[PDB]
Design an enzyme around this catalytic site. Structure first.
Site, PDB file in Angstrom:
ATOM      1  N   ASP A  16      24.726 -26.136 -36.162  1.00  0.00           N
ATOM      2  CA  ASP A  16      24.583 -27.554 -36.450  1.00  0.00           C
ATOM      3  C   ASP A  16      24.184 -28.279 -35.177  1.00  0.00           C
ATOM      4  OD1 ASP A  16      24.821 -29.729 -38.290  1.00  0.00           O
ATOM      5  OD2 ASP A  16      26.972 -29.973 -37.896  1.00  0.00           O
ATOM      6  N   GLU A  97      17.002 -33.998 -42.476  1.00  0.00           N
ATOM      7  CA  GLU A  97      17.532 -35.078 -43.341  1.00  0.00           C
ATOM      8  C   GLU A  97      16.591 -36.249 -43.507  1.00  0.00           C
ATOM      9  OE1 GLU A  97      21.714 -35.751 -43.015  1.00  0.00           O
ATOM     10  OE2 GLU A  97      21.667 -37.589 -44.238  1.00  0.00           O
ATOM     11  N   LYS A 133      17.640 -32.370 -46.437  1.00  0.00           N
ATOM     12  CA  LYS A 133      18.999 -32.888 -46.551  1.00  0.00           C
ATOM     13  C   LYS A 133      18.925 -34.302 -47.099  1.00  0.00           C
ATOM     14  CE  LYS A 133      22.395 -32.347 -43.489  1.00  0.00           C
ATOM     15  NZ  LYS A 133      23.156 -31.821 -42.239  1.00  0.00           N
ATOM     16  N   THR A 157      24.151 -33.440 -48.905  1.00  0.00           N
ATOM     17  CA  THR A 157      25.103 -33.658 -47.831  1.00  0.00           C
ATOM     18  C   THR A 157      26.039 -34.848 -48.132  1.00  0.00           C
ATOM     19  OG1 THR A 157      25.269 -33.692 -45.392  1.00  0.00           O
ATOM     20  CG2 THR A 157      23.537 -35.097 -46.372  1.00  0.00           C
ATOM     21  N   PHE A 179      31.949 -31.700 -46.692  1.00  0.00           N
ATOM     22  CA  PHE A 179      32.491 -32.011 -45.393  1.00  0.00           C
ATOM     23  C   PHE A 179      33.949 -31.668 -45.283  1.00  0.00           C
ATOM     24  CE2 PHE A 179      28.454 -33.476 -44.534  1.00  0.00           C
ATOM     25  CZ  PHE A 179      28.287 -34.501 -43.617  1.00  0.00           C
TER      26      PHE A 179
END
Lengths: 309, 311
Positions: A16, A97, A133, A157, A179
């Site tokens: 990440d 994203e 994303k 996400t 998450f």
């Protein structure tokens, strides 16, 4: 074997970060970016030439765009240039994203996602190496449903709720990123906790465990990728998850420890979705917050692009 | 001679009583009254209205022997909220607000259906629709429902308004009345900033929210009534003197009735995606809209459990 290498036996390890130079230290399969990580890679300045070359290229290819449209096109090309550099150092996919400002518009989400893919393809990267994303609002899920039908794989996400995850899987998305850390952050804030909760009591770990269990019992084929980590114990807790996306700091922590890793993990309408989200105070707040915060980081990135035109 | 703060307010603002306790309403002589699902639960649970609640559960049960249990409970719940509304209408000259089931808040079509069911129950008792406002949470789906209800002559009261965007969208939908909240916004402000005392009026985020909506509405020429709701102290009410309407709890009505100081007059297009973005940008509004729907839902489930215990 380090915990890192142990984890790779049972889980797809994902890095990440947008700092592509860090990624070879860990040999993940895939990598993920987000608007905050792209901003950090731009701000810390290891890649100023890449940024400067990207700006020049986009200006030359787009003599017809005014300043606002040019800045938007540069933001996309920056996201793609980082992705291309990441793809040079991994065997799998990169996640890029969309602008968080399109989160409540399925149409503009579809267009943004298609523009990212087209830019990758213009640079000779096939779409099979990219995930788009998208924040898992209803509008994002509806956009992803269409993009998947058109062969664009999505990474949904800002997932905070099990029903929210279920809807994503119902839409046929490639992958979801429930998450962990931000849920633990909420839990700690709720009762002014000074230390992390025990793993068994960690609301974020438990949220991913519950989604995993739902997907496997129901036979959903969407990939479960835990994301957002505050400590290495949270990542270790989810060993066996389909995938885990992990910061370079926590990848290094895993690389340097060598105890035994215990493997732990082995239709909804719009109105329904909106109701189930509303029942989850944490998810309602944290979805909204994520979109606000990523928007702030994208505006900061645009301001950096403007200062370098 | 100079009259009470209450009577002075009445002179410049439509005074509305915010309660299901109809017996209290007559001490204050408001024009209109408002209920919500929490206020109906409170009235149902209190000992003094136990005969009215009992009589309501009996009558519906008798007249609907063929309903499945889920349908039966739903029918009694609508009858209870309507029966309190009717007792209120008996003691006021104006309108009463009756809130749809909060569980329909994300469904425009079931909102419309629930609204029509409430109206039909009133009409069955001889009460015309012009005495009733249907209270609907101002989610996007509730605004869409209200737009359609207004086209059929059903006046709505759009509630749980925390952001100037809702308010604007409601106006654009032609709704009869909006209920921008004061108190709950000040609650957020005080909890978040650890405020020991209520903020100065000039600094009160709740009072400022209604002022901004009032100003927006009069500058645009919108005819939707602006009714401030949700209050924590008399001073917030007095701060909004001159607003179109103010709905006020009996405790605060009693404080206003007994004060004699002079009352100064202080108050004299959005797409779905735009609306959702602007709501998102407002952390407080996002949280409080959601919470209000959750809390009204919890209280309605407790009402349903009370109905089930008396069957």
């Amino acid at each position: 074997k380090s915990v890192l290498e142990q984890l790779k036996q049972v889980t797809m390890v994902v890095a990440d970060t947008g700092d592509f130079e860090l990624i070879k230290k860990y040999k993940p399969v895939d990598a993920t970016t987000n608007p905050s990580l792209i901003l950090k890679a731009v701000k810390e300045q290891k890649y100023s030439n890449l940024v400067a070359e990207t700006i020049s290229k986009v200006k030359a290819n787009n003599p017809d765009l005014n300043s606002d449209d040019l800045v938007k096109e540069i933001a996309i090309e920056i996201l793609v240039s980082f992705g291309i550099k990441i793809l040079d150092v991994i065997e799998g996919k990169v996640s890029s994203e969309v602008d968080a400002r399109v989160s409540f518009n399925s149409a503009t989400t579809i267009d943004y996602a298609k523009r990212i893919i087209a830019r990758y393809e213009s640079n000779g990267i096939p779409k099979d190496r990219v995930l788009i994303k998208i924040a898992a609002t209803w509008e994002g899920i509806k956009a992803a449903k269409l993009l998947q039908k058109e062969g664009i794989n999505c990474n949904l996400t800002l997932i905070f709720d099990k029903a929210q995850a279920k809807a994503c899987a119902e839409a046929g998305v490639y992958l979801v990123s429930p998450f962990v850390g931000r849920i633990t952050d909420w839990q700690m804030q709720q009762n002014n906790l000074k230390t992390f909760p025990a793993i068994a009591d960690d609301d974020g770990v438990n949220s991913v465990k519950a989604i995993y269990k739902l997907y496997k019992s129901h036979g959903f084929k969407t990939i479960v990728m835990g994301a957002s980590f505050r400590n290495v114990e949270q990542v270790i807790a989810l060993a066996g998850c389909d995938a885990l996306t992990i910061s370079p700091v926590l990848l290094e922590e895993l690389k340097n420890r060598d105890e035994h890793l215990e493997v732990k993990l082995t239709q909804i309408s719009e109105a329904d979705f909106r109701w189930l989200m509303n029942e989850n105070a944490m998810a309602t707040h944290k979805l909204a917050e994520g979109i606000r915060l990523f928007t702030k980081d994208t505006i900061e990135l645009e301001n950096i692009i403007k200062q370098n035109l």
